[PDB]
C-alpha cells in the first residue's frame, strides 16, 4: 500500500493543450504532469485517492527538456514526466 506521504507528492499539475483536451473530450483521459520518478502504479493510486475517480490504466512518457538561449547563454529546461490517465467510462473528472 503506497504511503499517503508519497501520494501527495507525485501529481504536479494538469497539462493543458489541444491534445490534452481532445483526449478528455474523446477518450475520457486526463493528461497530468507527474513527478519524474513516479511509477504507473503510484499515479493510479494517487488519482483514485485524491481526485476520487476510478482509473482504467496509466500510460507515461518522459518529456526531454529543451535547450534554450537566454542572453547569449545556453540553457536547458528540465525533463519531466507526463501521464495519460484513462478513466472508467463514467467518471468525468
Partner RNA sequence: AGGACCGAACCGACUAAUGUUGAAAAAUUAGCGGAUGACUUGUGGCUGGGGGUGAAAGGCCAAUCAAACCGGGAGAUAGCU
Partner RNA sequence: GCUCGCCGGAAGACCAAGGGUUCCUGUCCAACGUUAAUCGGGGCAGGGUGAGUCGACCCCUAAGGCGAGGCCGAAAGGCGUAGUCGAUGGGAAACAGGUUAAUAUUCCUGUACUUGGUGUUACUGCGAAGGGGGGACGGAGAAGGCUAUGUUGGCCGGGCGACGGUUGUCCCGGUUUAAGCGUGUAGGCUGGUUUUCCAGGCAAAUCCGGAAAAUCAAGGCUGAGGCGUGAUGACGAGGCACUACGGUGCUGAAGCAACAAAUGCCCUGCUUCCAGGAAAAGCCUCUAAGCAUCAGGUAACAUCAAAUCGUACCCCAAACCGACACAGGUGGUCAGGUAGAGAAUACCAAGGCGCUUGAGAGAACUCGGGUGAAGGAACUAGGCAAAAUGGUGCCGUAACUUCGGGAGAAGGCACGCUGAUAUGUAGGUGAGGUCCCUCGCGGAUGGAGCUGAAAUCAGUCGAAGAUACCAGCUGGCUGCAACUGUUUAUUAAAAACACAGCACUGUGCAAACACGAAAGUGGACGUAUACGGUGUGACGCCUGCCCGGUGCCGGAAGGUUAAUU
Residues that bind RNA (CB under 7 A): 15-20, 23, 27, 29, 31, 36-37, 39-41, 57, 59-64, 66-70, 81-82, 84, 86
Minimum CB distance to RNA, residue 7 (Å): 15
The nearer residue to RNA, 4 or 56, going by C-beta atoms, is 56
Minimum CB distance to RNA, residue 75 (Å): 10
Those residues whose C-beta lies under 8 Å from the C-beta of residue 60, and which sit 6 or more positions away, are 34, 38, 40, 43, 81, 82, 83, 84
The nearer residue to RNA, 2 or 63, going by C-beta atoms, is 63
CA dihedral 80, 13, 21, 40 (to 10 degrees): 60
Minimum CB distance to RNA, residue 32 (Å): 11
CA–CA separation, 34 vs 43, rounded Å? 8
10 Cα distance to chain centroid: 9
The nearer residue to RNA, 3 or 69, going by C-beta atoms, is 69
Amino acid at each position: 500500500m503506497i504511503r499517503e506521504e508519497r501520494l501527495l507528492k507525485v501529481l504536479r499539475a494538469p497539462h493543458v493543450s489541444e491534445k490534452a483536451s481532445t483526449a478528455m473530450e474523446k477518450s475520457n483521459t486526463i493528461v497530468l504532469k507527474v513527478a519524474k520518478d513516479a511509477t504507473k502504479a503510484e499515479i493510479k493510486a494517487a488519482v483514485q485517492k485524491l481526485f476520487e475517480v476510478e482509473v482504467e490504466v496509466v500510460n507515461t512518457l518522459v518529456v526531454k527538456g529543451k535547450v534554450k538561449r537566454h542572453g547569449q547563454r545556453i540553457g536547458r529546461r528540465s525533463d519531466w514526466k507526463k501521464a495519460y490517465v484513462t478513466l472508467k467510462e463514467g467518471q468525468n473528472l
